[PDB]
Design a protein around this ligand. Structure first.
Ligand code: ATP
Ligand code: ATP
Ligand code: ATP
Ligand code: ATP
Ligand code: ADP
Lengths: 544, 527, 54, 217
């Protein structure tokens, strides 16, 4: 019948006690029980749901085989799936990994005795892979997050106790909009075999009557403490996720409201995350776009320990996102064979993780519209048309005109700066461009030369800015930016200072950066009649 | 009797224990009869306060072991308030009932009762305030005060308040007879840092779980800036680096080498990575100094050596004498000769408890008044420790000198001039080191009278010193380093560059064309 | 010489919270806490009239 | 009714292919009509079988902006009441703000639950729900820019951000907004997934002017 899977590899047994008035409190040793089970019952065929009467020292039991593993001789590892189907059977051997779990009645004081085995309800599901999450890019941060947070819950508890340590209980994610910082929270909530998450939107706590707001924030932990006082360590994890934290938990001490509610909620949460009493089985998630307004106290270790930054993807991630989004389309044979994803990834320079999806939507929208022709030529819908739908490459090319980046807004200036075209009416230009390329390469290869500055000067009207733009464009660096008078016009002085400061500051993110400054002279308000000009901007630049 | 102070885990804070014990509980050790014959009242109100993450909550939790009888009651600030009208006020005056009754019955034999408000600042904000919502937030505090001041002879109560921010609280709680003693609990010292390691690492040490390789003293030395909270955080980071070597999270399934579990052990490098993960909000980050000197000191000539010995003379000078409580020096030379690094060398070699630097980078971007404030902040702060080294970088830039007007900001100049002449408060000494590159300008503003002594630092000129630096840089092979100098000898014997430019040229030539034709060319154009 | 530095005055807003009547007390207040003893009586009518119908 | 083997269009269709641009009565603006109908409504006419095979959610946002007195409200009103959907839930500009400490934000939460519950009950055969924000640019300003000593400018924006695209999915509503000045709306409201299609409505062409005269008289 089985062919090959003829032995019982690992057997998990719900050991209910026979008669519940007889409940023996003495510790029950899984090793003794396994040895007795093998010794008394050997070379028998067992299937899932076979019930058995086990007489051990006069204390009977109702053994139920919840699950059975069937393995063939010669399998070094038990890669065969533990099958819950009654069809699978095996022959008991002296090597059967016999796991006992308490019965449905939970009456049996089973012990792990040097059983280096998966914990009873090890949350992380022993066979689990990052590719199955469905998140393209960000293949490194999962390492940080899973290593620091969930690495310590899987491991058997007694040794962890020997370490004399307590689990972490905080997790924070922050970044600019649309980078994918909500998907993670959701799938972590859904894929981890824990209780259902207790979702709360940001300003959903506050309430009319005095003293009802705080009451609500301490109803969330009620089940956790209720459970913890009873079952102690063998609790399964509770997870509660805060969405969009900075709405309510601002730095206390401001004059935010005029009533004094924010302080109270901050106070309650602070008291309860660490407090006098120990919980040791809870985990809280956060999302936000600004890390700077959270009250400092939250960030001390013991509360929101690990903090992870989510930034815009690179090219590889872009390719991965196209791979994930356009998944079903391909395997359902709805896709033309002409599209090659690498080129798409190449085109979309500054696209964020949330924009690619709109691209897909638009591309499909063109496809479907070709058939329906809403309006004038109505009613053409028929089986033939819809039976051969396929998107084509030019649809995506067309789609690029609808979706537009949000961060790639300053490079457009650069490409339009050379609208006039370029001409090589002299040798000189070639020499200059070559020299610039030499320098660009040089900064690329080196490690210790982390800052290089150049200047271009010549008579007015000589066509300087365009040359710099052409030098810049051909580098291919991830990060390019331009500061020109057109941007700063109409602002107030302090705003100018702030803007330039911010520009330099966010120019410190990518490994490689190129920054262009146009017509310094006009930036500083030079007029020779005085002469007069603004010292502060000058000094700022000179420092920077 | 079954107690001694050693037996509990609070590390470092020993003095505070002595002070609190002497202030709070000493009076109630004796039989009562003495104290009335001594005509002294007992202290009733206590305040503990400090920055986030100092350990206070651990003290409030544990102290109930030492302090006999039964149990201090515990409450959280925001639990007190309530929905019904009048309930919230009732709640506070419900806590005092038991002790009141027992006392009222038994007289002075009453067992001492303790109550602790964790997180006091929740509701006891300053009652003389406005906003004119529902006035519950006033009634509450009034109630406590009534029960706390006109106690009507209730002398068996100590109320303990825990906070992170003293300022918020009503001044009408901070007065004699009500919250008398306020104990500040600040960051631990190095020795306390060691005890914190000791207490945190106890269990893991007994059980043979850390490799003997590790040596706590050096870890304590490195971690210059950490509260206890971070210390257990670091411990768990190190442990995690250990645990993650067997269990390969994500890749594959859970692959547990059952054998290696028995041999699990933390090691030093794990601790270093753990260090690399965590970062204090301690924030001063004076490692600034070392990044300034990251280009390093090769000691290419005797001049640097002489200068260094002179600096050593001054540091000894300020350390030893008691009448020299303030010394200032100026360091001037050509631009790019390299000056800031040398002062940094002196400072870092000094090894005083206390150092900071001021540089335009951190000053960048504020408005003028904020500059003024910052500068004042830093000076006042510097006056605390007995011995202090402070450095001022590129004064001319701090004053915004531009020769067109010439225009510059007067107020900052005046502030600096006044500051440099301030002898510190009693029994402190200070050493202030200022560098500049535009000596003549300083002459002509005529503030040159505030500097005790001045040091010149001429840039290098002789081809031999070039040979020294380039052998240090390992620019080329030996024959290369000889041939270049031989060619330079006749190409352009007269020579005046600096140092920074030399390094820059060396690197450019190293990549592009390490023969003569580039390095020597650039050196000639520069010279 | 001079410019701007601190200004406003006539401009502010306030929210407003609210408590509740005390008598309210616990939900059990007339036709709530009495339903415990009123049920035993009603069980008495049920019974005595079970005797009636039998 | 039931979907036969033959792929015929939806039983309770929304657009009804006996439909025409000259029925609206809006003259002038013509290409913009093409765009809006192409991008938004197209996904909802084809059979659900293919569109679910196409694993794309419909667009859930519309924004209209332009100078004063150009026809924005006309577009909104017409689209409101010649489709096959439930009555729109109109809200004027500052209608949401409320007195007590937690009444405004409950008021934002009030708008959506009907679609939420009905979506839970049935699923992909839901009737469409429409909600119209008139004059978006009063309360939804950039976060952290106004001092807002009265903290309503942040709670409102956060509530709407959380609930339009949050941890729980919902794909049977359509929200459409009107404004005169799109430069002050918070930037997080203008990414794909929220208010995808944005349309400028400009002054009319001469030929459009002829069309308008034709309509009016
Ligand atoms: N790997 C990915 N990175 C980014 N976005 C993704 C990814 N995979 C799918 N997406 C799609 O892009 C969207 C990303 O937006 P998300 O749900 O994270 O909101 P968000 O980025 O948190 O925006 P905000 O921070 O303003 O809430 C998702 O709704 C999802 O449908
Ligand atoms: N070497 C060149 N060959 C051909 N065309 C050029 C060249 N350099 C610049 N141009 C063209 O001439 C124009 C250059 O004008 P641009 O304003 O950049 O000159 P500029 O001198 O930097 O400006 P300004 O007059 O403000 O100083 C651009 O339209 C560019 O396309
Ligand atoms: N013997 C040396 N003397 C001085 N600087 C040296 C020496 N050896 C190496 N250096 C390095 O050379 C560099 C030049 O010094 P630094 O960068 O402080 O320039 P600087 O002259 O202070 O600049 P500025 O004119 O802007 O003040 C520094 O990195 C310094 O550490
Ligand atoms: N393109 C158009 N076609 C037909 N009618 C139009 C058009 N533009 C404006 N109208 C007429 O103008 C009237 C008012 O238009 P509407 O209320 O949309 O202006 P508005 O853009 O809403 O102005 P505001 O922005 O000040 O509210 C409508 O009743 C309509 O009859
Ligand atoms: N000697 C120590 N000093 C400081 N913290 C310690 C010490 N020993 C242990 N800790 C840990 O540091 C944490 C202190 O938290 P705490 O500073 O009381 O928070 P808060 O300041 O908000 O009350 C506790 O979790 C405690 O276990």
């Amino acid at each position: 019948y089985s062919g090959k899977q003829s032995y019982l590899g690992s057997i998990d047994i719900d050991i209910s006690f026979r008669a519940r008035g007889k409940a023996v409190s003495t510790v029950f040793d899984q090793d003794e029980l396994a040895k007795q089970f093998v010794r008394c019952y050997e070379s028998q065929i067992f299937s899932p749901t076979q019930y058995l009467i086990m007489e051990f020292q006069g204390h009977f039991f109702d053994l139920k085989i919840r699950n059975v593993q069937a393995i063939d001789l010669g399998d070094i590892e038990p890669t065969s799936a533990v099958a819950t189907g009654i069809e699978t059977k095996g022959i008991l051997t002296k090597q059967t990994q016999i796991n006992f779990f308490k019965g449905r009645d939970g009456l049996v004081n089973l012990k792990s005795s040097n059983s280096l085995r998966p914990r009873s309800n090890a949350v992380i599901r022993p066979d689990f892979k990052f590719e199955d999450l469905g998140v393209g890019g960000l293949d490194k941060e999962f390492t940080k997050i899973f290593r620091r947070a969930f690495a310590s819950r899987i491991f058997p508890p007694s040794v962890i106790e020997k370490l004399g340590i307590s689990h972490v209980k905080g997790l924070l994610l922050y970044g600019p909009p649309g980078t994918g910082k909500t998907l993670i929270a959701r799938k972590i909530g859904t894929m981890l075999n824990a209780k259902e998450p207790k979702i709360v939107n940001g300003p959903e706590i506050l309430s009319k009557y005095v003293g009802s707001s705080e009451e609500n924030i301490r109803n969330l932990f009620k089940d956790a403490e209720a459970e913890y006082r009873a079952k102690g360590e063998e609790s399964s994890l509770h997870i509660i996720i805060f969405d969009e934290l900075d709405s309510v938990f601002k730095q206390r001490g401001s004059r935010g409201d005029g009533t004094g509610v924010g302080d109270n909620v901050v106070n309650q949460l602070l008291a309860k995350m660490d407090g006098v009493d120990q919980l040791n089985n809870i985990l809280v998630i956060g999302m936000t776009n600004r890390k700077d307004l959270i009250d400092s106290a939250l960030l001390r270790p013991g509360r929101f320990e690990v903090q992870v930054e989510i930034h815009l993807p690179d090219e590889k991630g872009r390719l991965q996102i196209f791979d994930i989004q356009t998944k079903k389309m391909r395997e359902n044979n709805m896709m033309s064979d002409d599209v090659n994803l690498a080129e798409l990834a190449a085109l979309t320079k500054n696209f964020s993780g949330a924009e690619i999806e709109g691209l897909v939507k638009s591309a499909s929208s063109f496809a479907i519209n070709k058939t329906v022709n809403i309006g004038k030529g109505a009613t053409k819908l028929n089986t033939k048309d819809i039976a051969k739908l396929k998107v084509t490459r030019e649809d995506f090319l067309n789609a690029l005109n609808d979706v537009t980046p949000a961060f790639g807004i300053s490079e457009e200036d650069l490409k339009t700066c050379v609208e006039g075209g370029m001409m090589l009416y002299s040798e000189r230009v070639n020499s200059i461009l070559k020299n610039g390329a030499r320098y660009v390469r040089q900064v690329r290869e080196s490690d210790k030369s982390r800052l290089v500055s150049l200047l271009i000067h010549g008579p007015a009207g000589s066509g300087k800015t365009a040359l710099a733009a052409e030098i810049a464009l051909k580098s291919g660096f991830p990060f390019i930016r331009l500061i020109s008078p057109n941007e700063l016009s109409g602002m107030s002085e302090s705003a100018k200072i702030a803007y330039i400061d911010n520009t330099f500051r966010d120019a410190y993110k990518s490994p490689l950066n190129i920054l262009v400054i146009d017509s310094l002279e006009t930036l500083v308000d030079w007029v020779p009649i005085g002469p007069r000009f603004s010292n502060n901007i000058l000094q700022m630049l000179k420092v920077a | 009797p079954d107690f001694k102070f050693e037996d509990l885990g609070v590390g470092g804070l020993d003095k505070e224990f002595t002070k609190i014990f002497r202030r709070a509980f000493a009076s109630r050790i004796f039989p009562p009869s003495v104290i009335e014959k001594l005509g002294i009242s007992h202290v009733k109100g206590l305040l503990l306060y400090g920055p986030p993450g100092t350990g206070k909550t651990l003290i409030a939790r544990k102290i109930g072991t030492m302090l006999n009888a039964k149990e201090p009651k515990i409450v959280n600030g925001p639990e007190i308030l309530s929905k019904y009208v009048g309930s919230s006020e009732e709640n506070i005056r419900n806590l005092f009932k038991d002790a009141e009754a027992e006392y009222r019955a038994k007289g002075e034999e009453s067992s001492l009762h303790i109550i602790i408000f964790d997180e006091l600042d929740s509701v006891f904000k300053q009652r003389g305030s406005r906003g004119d919502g529902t006035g519950v937030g006033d009634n509450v505090v009034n109630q406590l005060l009534a029960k706390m001041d006109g106690v009507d002879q209730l002398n068996n109560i100590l109320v303990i308040g825990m906070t992170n921010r003293k300022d918020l609280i009503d001044s009408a709680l901070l007065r004699p007879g009500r919250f008398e003693v306020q104990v500040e609990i600040h960051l631990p010292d190095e020795k306390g840092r060691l005890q914190i390691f000791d207490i945190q690492t106890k269990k893991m040490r007994e059980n043979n779980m850390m490799s003997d390789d590790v040596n706590l003293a050096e870890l304590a030395a490195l971690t210059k800036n950490f509260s206890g909270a971070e210390i257990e955080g670091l411990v768990k980071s190190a442990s995690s680096f250990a645990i993650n070597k067997t269990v390969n999270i994500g890749k594959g399934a859970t692959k547990l080498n059952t054998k290696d579990i028995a041999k699990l052990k933390v090691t030093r490098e794990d601790f270093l990575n753990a260090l690399n993960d965590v970062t204090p909000a301690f924030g001063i980050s004076e490692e600034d100094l070392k990044t300034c000197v990251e280009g390093g000191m090769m000691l290419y000539s005797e001049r640097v050596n002489s200068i260094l010995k002179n600096g050593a003379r001054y540091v000894r000078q300020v350390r030893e004498s008691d009448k020299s409580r303030l010394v200032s020096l100026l360091i001037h030379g050509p631009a790019g000769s390299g000056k800031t690094a040398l002062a940094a060398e002196i400072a870092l070699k000094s090894g005083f408890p206390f150092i900071r630097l001021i540089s335009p980078n951190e000053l960048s971007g504020m408005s003028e008044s904020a500059k003024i404030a910052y500068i004042d902040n830093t000076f006042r702060d510097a006056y605390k420790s007995p011995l202090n080294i402070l450095v001022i970088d590129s004064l001319e830039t701090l004053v915004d000198w531009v020769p067109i007007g010439p225009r510059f900001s007067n107020n900052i100049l005046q502030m600096l001039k006044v500051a440099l002449k301030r002898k510190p408060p009693q029994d402190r000494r200070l050493l202030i080191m200022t560098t500049t590159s535009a000596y003549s300008v300083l002459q002509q503003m005529d503030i040159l009278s505030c500097f005790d002594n001045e040091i010149a630092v001429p840039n290098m000129t002789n081809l031999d010193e070039l040979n020294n630096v380039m052998i240090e840089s390992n620019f080329l092979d030996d024959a290369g380093r000889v041939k270049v100098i031989n060619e330079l000898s006749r190409s352009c014997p007269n020579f005046n560059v600096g140092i920074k430019k030399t390094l820059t040229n060396i690197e450019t030539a190293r990549h592009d064309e390490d023969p003569v034709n580039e390095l020597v060319e650039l050196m000639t154009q520069s010279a | 010489e001079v410019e701007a530095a601190i200004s406003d005055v006539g401009g502010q807003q306030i929210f407003s919270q609210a408590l509740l009547n005390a008598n309210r007390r616990g939900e059990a207040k007339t036709a709530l806490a009495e339903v415990q003893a009123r049920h035993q009586e009603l069980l008495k009518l049920e019974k005595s009239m079970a005797e009636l119908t039998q």
